[PDB]
Design a protein around this motif. Structure first.
Motif, PDB file in Angstrom:
ATOM      1  N   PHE A 155       0.833  -1.197   0.000  1.00 28.62           N
ATOM      2  CA  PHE A 155       0.000   0.000   0.000  1.00 28.62           C
ATOM      3  C   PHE A 155       0.870   1.250   0.000  1.00 28.62           C
ATOM      4  O   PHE A 155       0.689   2.140   0.828  1.00 28.62           O
ATOM      5  CB  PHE A 155      -0.945   0.020   1.205  1.00 28.62           C
ATOM      6  CG  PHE A 155      -1.773  -1.227   1.352  1.00 28.62           C
ATOM      7  CD1 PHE A 155      -2.797  -1.507   0.459  1.00 28.62           C
ATOM      8  CD2 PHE A 155      -1.544  -2.108   2.397  1.00 28.62           C
ATOM      9  CE1 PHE A 155      -3.562  -2.648   0.598  1.00 28.62           C
ATOM     10  CE2 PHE A 155      -2.308  -3.251   2.540  1.00 28.62           C
ATOM     11  CZ  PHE A 155      -3.319  -3.519   1.639  1.00 28.62           C
TER      12      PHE A 155
ATOM     13  N   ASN C  30       2.110   0.740   7.008  1.00 25.25           N
ATOM     14  CA  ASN C  30       1.833   1.577   5.848  1.00 25.25           C
ATOM     15  C   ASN C  30       2.395   2.978   6.042  1.00 25.25           C
ATOM     16  O   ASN C  30       3.005   3.543   5.129  1.00 25.25           O
ATOM     17  CB  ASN C  30       0.327   1.637   5.588  1.00 25.25           C
ATOM     18  CG  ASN C  30      -0.020   2.323   4.278  1.00 25.25           C
ATOM     19  OD1 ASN C  30       0.853   2.790   3.549  1.00 25.25           O
ATOM     20  ND2 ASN C  30      -1.310   2.388   3.975  1.00 25.25           N
ATOM     21  N   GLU C  61      36.973  22.485 -11.457  1.00 27.54           N
ATOM     22  CA  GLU C  61      37.335  22.621 -12.868  1.00 27.54           C
ATOM     23  C   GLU C  61      36.631  23.825 -13.496  1.00 27.54           C
ATOM     24  O   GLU C  61      35.800  23.706 -14.395  1.00 27.54           O
ATOM     25  CB  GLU C  61      37.016  21.332 -13.618  1.00 27.54           C
ATOM     26  CG  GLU C  61      38.170  20.342 -13.657  1.00 27.54           C
ATOM     27  CD  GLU C  61      37.779  19.010 -14.263  1.00 27.54           C
ATOM     28  OE1 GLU C  61      36.619  18.870 -14.700  1.00 27.54           O
ATOM     29  OE2 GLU C  61      38.636  18.103 -14.309  1.00 27.54           O
ATOM     30  N   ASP C  62      36.984  25.011 -12.991  1.00 26.79           N
ATOM     31  CA  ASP C  62      36.540  26.272 -13.574  1.00 26.79           C
ATOM     32  C   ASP C  62      37.677  27.286 -13.610  1.00 26.79           C
ATOM     33  O   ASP C  62      37.438  28.496 -13.521  1.00 26.79           O
ATOM     34  CB  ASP C  62      35.348  26.855 -12.812  1.00 26.79           C
ATOM     35  CG  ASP C  62      34.472  27.748 -13.684  1.00 26.79           C
ATOM     36  OD1 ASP C  62      34.175  27.360 -14.836  1.00 26.79           O
ATOM     37  OD2 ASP C  62      34.084  28.842 -13.222  1.00 26.79           O
ATOM     38  N   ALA C  63      38.913  26.813 -13.731  1.00 24.82           N
ATOM     39  CA  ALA C  63      40.074  27.691 -13.792  1.00 24.82           C
ATOM     40  C   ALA C  63      41.269  26.965 -14.400  1.00 24.82           C
ATOM     41  O   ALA C  63      41.742  27.321 -15.479  1.00 24.82           O
ATOM     42  CB  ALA C  63      40.419  28.216 -12.405  1.00 24.82           C
TER      43      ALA C  63
ATOM     44  N   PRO E   1      42.241  25.390 -18.721  1.00 21.78           N
ATOM     45  CA  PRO E   1      41.017  24.778 -19.249  1.00 21.78           C
ATOM     46  C   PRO E   1      41.269  23.389 -19.821  1.00 21.78           C
ATOM     47  O   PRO E   1      40.326  22.691 -20.196  1.00 21.78           O
ATOM     48  CB  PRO E   1      40.589  25.751 -20.349  1.00 21.78           C
ATOM     49  CG  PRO E   1      41.851  26.416 -20.772  1.00 21.78           C
ATOM     50  CD  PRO E   1      42.685  26.533 -19.536  1.00 21.78           C
ATOM     51  N   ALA E   3      42.410  20.657 -18.302  1.00 21.03           N
ATOM     52  CA  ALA E   3      41.890  19.599 -17.440  1.00 21.03           C
ATOM     53  C   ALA E   3      40.368  19.619 -17.381  1.00 21.03           C
ATOM     54  O   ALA E   3      39.730  18.559 -17.350  1.00 21.03           O
ATOM     55  CB  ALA E   3      42.485  19.728 -16.038  1.00 21.03           C
ATOM     56  N   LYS E   4      39.763  20.812 -17.371  1.00 18.23           N
ATOM     57  CA  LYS E   4      38.313  20.909 -17.236  1.00 18.23           C
ATOM     58  C   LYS E   4      37.574  20.326 -18.434  1.00 18.23           C
ATOM     59  O   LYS E   4      36.392  19.992 -18.309  1.00 18.23           O
ATOM     60  CB  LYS E   4      37.899  22.366 -17.012  1.00 18.23           C
ATOM     61  CG  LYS E   4      37.725  23.194 -18.275  1.00 18.23           C
ATOM     62  CD  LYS E   4      36.910  24.450 -17.983  1.00 18.23           C
ATOM     63  CE  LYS E   4      37.282  25.595 -18.911  1.00 18.23           C
ATOM     64  NZ  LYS E   4      36.938  26.918 -18.319  1.00 18.23           N
TER      65      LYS E   4
END
Lengths: 155, 81, 63, 97, 184, 91, 150, 129
Positions: A155, C30, C61-63, E1, E3-4
């Motif tokens: 249920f 229930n 991973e932004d730089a 960039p 590696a990313k």
């Protein structure tokens, strides 16, 4: 075990030869004697804290699992604290070199800590005669799903 | 002849034999790109219609299904897609 | 009650208290089941829309 | 070919069921379709024709008694008349049938 | 960039291809939202039977279908700037051992991670544009085994000069012999 | 429980009157006390008032039917054949 | 074949080897589940909808296009029918056959036919009982089953 | 229905071999027959056979070089102990020197002389000669 109001029958259902004392109040104040059944069969927690008696249980009672260990399925759930398992197996007829599905309905006294229901594969162990026809004990329930946990009504 | 290249039979054999008794049970039906002068939307229609077909943009009938490949309507412009 | 199996009142009350006892249990199961349907899954399913684009994908991973 | 679309009303659209609820739902004017059984008393269906005429709403005569209608509406009891307050993905309202 | 887009800091050895994607910045319609989001995992290099190399780049297939959209456009531009090599795209897929009767139980192994299914999709990765019409297998008399692969006539132009590389990479990767044959 | 095998309603007649006479009365006495659907209210409430009179318990209607059924077969064919004669004369 | 008949027919659909959508398909997977929803919201059969996906649309099959079968995606979409269509249409067939019986009681040909519908239902109902598609300890009482099939 | 694809495989080969056909077709092309064919293939009894992998378990074509004379199945697959494997062969083999009986085994699928040599047994799949 602790629940179901074990202390409700005619007599005083406690483990024999255990020491109770109201003079000294200890951490738990209740003494329960369980022993592991051995051969690798674990002691259930519901028996560690157990208040069931089942003087014929291997773990809390005064019996001993000394002999064979078998397996089967639950087919008889109309009976308190006692189970009968339909252990299907095969037998080799020599002349025809073929096999034959046999089965026997062996009855076993389930320790009330364990829970059993139709379809759950269970294990039992030979011991001293528990009843006339119950001469085994449900030492371990190897029902991780019991072929029914995922098939029941939901249920 | 008991010596036959069942692996690569000629194109006569495939169109001759049954679909399910071919080497690979490939469909022989197809879908048809079909247009009507009174609509501006394309419409892909299965070979055997199996049910009435209507353009969403303009209410119309395209091909009424029969047991096999449906007899298309009179003013119906069909093409194999 | 119109049929048999209730010899008397206290036999009936035992069935009723048993009927209440288990009846409380399946809806308790229930409710615990539904708790799982909204606790272990409902929020942890959203973990893929709050951290999956947060850790080891866009910050480091932004730089 | 009427019974197939009543399940569409019973699940998608909003209905009311039975006489007293229908005439209330005609008096409020919300109802647009009423399906009257054939087993219903002709006097009760006669003045439901009148209430339907007053509300300017479609009246459909079911091809069977209240037993067929009760099954058709999907309920294992019997229904004299069934009213269609609002119809969802069902097309019974917009169709002439 | 570097590696990313490499999806991982390692390895500095194979950055010669990652830097080649990030240097087409004068491709504004094609640079945005379809080249940056692609983060291939690993690169492998194998010497084709012709004495040349084919680089086996592995794409984690989170959006390979999106990578398939620009696959036709990207393969040509990649080959030119990285000439005398063949580019191939592979969807690396987990493969788990078939459990043994003495082995402890594990969670279920679905049919995508099965050994036969990955090789099914390897053919699709190996031959993207041409849908495989069918397959054949020849079990050789000496105990060998071959898998003859059929192809359709449509869009074989991007692959017909890379068929021999397809055979070599599958043998090197899987130790299994295949040969590509197209009817008509 | 299952009280009788084949006498059924006619077991009130004891061992007397023979078995064939009990068999003829059996197959009609069932039809006699069986409750029937009313053609007007739709409830299975029609009971036999008297010989040939069938009073629907609700909606207080009564229909002149057979002595042991709400409507005999030999009269159902009457209704059917009356329809065609009315049908053909008019249309 | 032919569970309860002497026929030998094998007239059936033979779907292509190719497991991907044809090149001329111009609908995304999210753009075909919308036809799924607005066709299922009308209550049409999962078989019945796929026919129109085939006919009025370019959708060949759910599996060749999407990653799941039609009946699979309806589970997530929230339009799972009360009972599976096999029992639904077999029982709906059963009621119609019975409905013919209580008036034309001398149809022993159709009477024997009924048992083929009932037996087909029960074996099929056993399967759904085994895989637990329907609730276990289920029955086809043959009288109030009409509540299950309208 | 097809109670044993292995049975219908060896049945089909014998039917076509007796006709003398150079090629025979088998369905639905499981691996047990494929593993069975390998055993003949290393023993020259069978020639180049082409497996066709359609998406419904496919089928096979077997270019038998008209080499074997009778290959059959022992259905059902009776078990056998190594002490009695020779007892089975005598009732099935035209001769000891040539003709083999196929034993399925957790080691693998092999003819009896190697199963005897590597010393492992199992259930009987069929016989080839």
């Amino acid at each position: 075990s602790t629940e179901l109001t074990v202390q409700s029958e005619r007599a005083f259902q406690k483990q024999p030869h255990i020491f109770n004392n109201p003079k000294v109040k200890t951490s738990k104040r209740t003494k329960r004697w369980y022993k592991n059944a051995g051969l690798g069969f674990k002691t259930p927690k519901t028996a560690i804290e157990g208040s069931y008696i089942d003087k014929k249980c291997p773990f809390t009672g005064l019996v001993s699992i000394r002999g064979k260990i078998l397996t089967g399925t639950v087919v008889s759930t109309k009976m308190h604290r006692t189970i009968v398992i339909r252990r299907a197996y095969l037998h080799y007829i020599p002349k025809y070199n073929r096999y034959e599905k046999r089965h026997k309905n062996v009855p076993v006294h389930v320790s009330p800590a364990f829970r059993v229901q139709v379809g759950d594969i269970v294990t039992v162990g030979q011991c001293r005669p528990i009843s006339k026809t119950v001469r085994f004990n449900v030492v371990k329930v190897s029902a991780a799903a019991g072929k029914a946990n995922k098939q029941f009504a939901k249920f | 002849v008991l010596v036959q290249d069942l692996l690569h039979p000629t194109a006569a054999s495939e169109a001759r034999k049954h679909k399910l008794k071919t080497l690979v049970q490939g469909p022989r039906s197809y879908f048809l790109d079909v247009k009507c002068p009174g609509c501006l939307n394309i419409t892909t229609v299965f070979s055997h219609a199996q049910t009435a077909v209507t353009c969403e943009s303009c209410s119309t009938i395209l091909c009424t299904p029969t047991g096999g490949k449906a007899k298309l309507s009179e003013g119906t412009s069909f093409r194999r897609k | 009650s119109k049929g048999n199996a209730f010899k008397h009142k206290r036999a009936l009350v035992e069935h009723i208290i048993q009927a209440k006892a288990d009846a409380q249990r399946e809806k308790a199961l229930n409710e615990e089941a539904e708790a799982r349907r909204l606790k272990n899954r409902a929020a942890r399913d959203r973990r893929a829309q709050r951290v999956a684009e947060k850790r080891d994908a866009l910050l480091k991973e932004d730089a | 070919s009427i019974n197939q679309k009543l399940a569409l009303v019973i699940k998608s659209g909003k209905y009311t069921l039975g006489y007293k609820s229908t005439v209330k739902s005609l008096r409020q004017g919300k109802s647009k379709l009423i399906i009257i059984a054939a087993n219903t008393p002709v006097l009760r269906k006669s003045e439901l024709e009148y209430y339907a005429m007053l509300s300017k709403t479609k009246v459909y005569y079911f091809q069977g008694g209240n037993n067929e209608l009760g099954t058709a509406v999907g309920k294992l009891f019997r229904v004299g008349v069934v009213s269609i307050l609002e119809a969802g993905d069902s097309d019974i309202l917009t169709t002439l049938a | 960039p570097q590696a990313k887009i490499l999806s991982q800091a390692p390895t500095e050895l194979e950055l010669q291809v990652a830097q080649a994607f990030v240097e087409l910045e004068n491709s504004s319609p094609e640079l945005k939202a379809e080249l940056r989001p692609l983060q291939f995992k690993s690169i492998r290099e194998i010497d084709v039977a012709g004495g040349k190399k084919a680089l086996a780049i592995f794409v984690p297939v989170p959006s390979l279908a999106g990578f398939h959209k620009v696959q036709t456009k990207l393969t040509r531009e990649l080959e030119k700037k990285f000439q005398d090599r063949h580019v191939i795209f592979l969807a690396e897929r987990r493969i788990l051992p078939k459990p043994s009767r003495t082995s402890r139980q594990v969670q279920k192994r679905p049919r995508s991670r099965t050994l036969t299914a990955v090789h099914d999709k390897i053919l699709e990765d190996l031959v993207f544009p041409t849908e495989i019409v069918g397959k054949r297998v020849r079990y050789l008399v000496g105990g060998n085994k071959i898998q003859k692969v059929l192809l359709d006539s449509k869009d074989v132009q991007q692959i017909d000069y890379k068929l021999e590389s397809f055979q070599a990479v599958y043998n090197k990767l899987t130790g299994k012999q295949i040969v590509f044959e197209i009817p008509s | 429980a299952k009280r009788t095998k084949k006498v059924g309603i006619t077991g009130k007649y004891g061992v007397r009157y023979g078995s064939s006479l009990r068999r003829q009365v059996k197959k009609l006495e069932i039809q006699q006390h069986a409750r029937y659907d009313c053609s007007f209210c739709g409830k299975k409430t029609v009971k036999r008032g008297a010989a040939g009179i069938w009073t629907c318990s609700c909606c207080k209607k009564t229909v002149a039917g057979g002595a042991y059924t709400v409507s005999t077969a030999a009269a159902a064919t009457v209704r059917s054949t009356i329809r065609r004669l009315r049908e053909m004369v008019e249309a | 074949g032919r569970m309860h008949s002497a026929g030998k027919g094998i007239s059936s659909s033979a779907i292509p080897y190719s497991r991907n959508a044809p090149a001329w398909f111009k609908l995304s997977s999210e753009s075909v589940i919308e036809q799924i929803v607005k066709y299922a919201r009308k209550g049409l059969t999962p078989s019945q909808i796929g026919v129109l996906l085939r006919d009025a649309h370019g959708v060949t099959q759910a599996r060749v296009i999407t990653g799941n079968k039609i009946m699979r995606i309806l589970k997530s979409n929230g339009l799972a029918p009360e009972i599976p269509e096999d029992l639904y249409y077999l029982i709906k067939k059963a009621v119609s056959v019975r409905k013919h019986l209580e008036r034309n009681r001398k149809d022993k040909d159709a009477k024997f036919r009924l048992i083929l519908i009932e037996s087909r239902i029960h074996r099929l109902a056993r399967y759904y009982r085994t895989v637990a598609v329907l609730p276990p300890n289920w029955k086809y009482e043959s009288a109030t089953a009409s509540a299950l099939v309208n | 229905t097809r109670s044993s694809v292995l049975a219908d495989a060896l049945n089909a080969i014998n039917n076509a071999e007796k006709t003398g056909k150079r090629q025979v077709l088998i369905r639905p092309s499981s691996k047990v027959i494929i593993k069975f064919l390998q055993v003949m293939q290393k023993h020259g009894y069978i020639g180049e056979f082409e497996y066709i992998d359609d998406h419904r378990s496919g089928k096979i074509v077997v270019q038998l070089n008209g080499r074997l004379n009778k290959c059959g199945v022992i259905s059902p697959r009776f078990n056998v102990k190594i002490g009695d494997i020779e007892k089975w062969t005598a009732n099935l083999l035209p001769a000891r020197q040539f003709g083999y009986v196929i034993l399925t085994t957790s080691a693998g699928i092999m003819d009896h002389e190697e199963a005897r040599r590597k010393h492992v047994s199992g259930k009987i799949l069929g016989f080839v000669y």
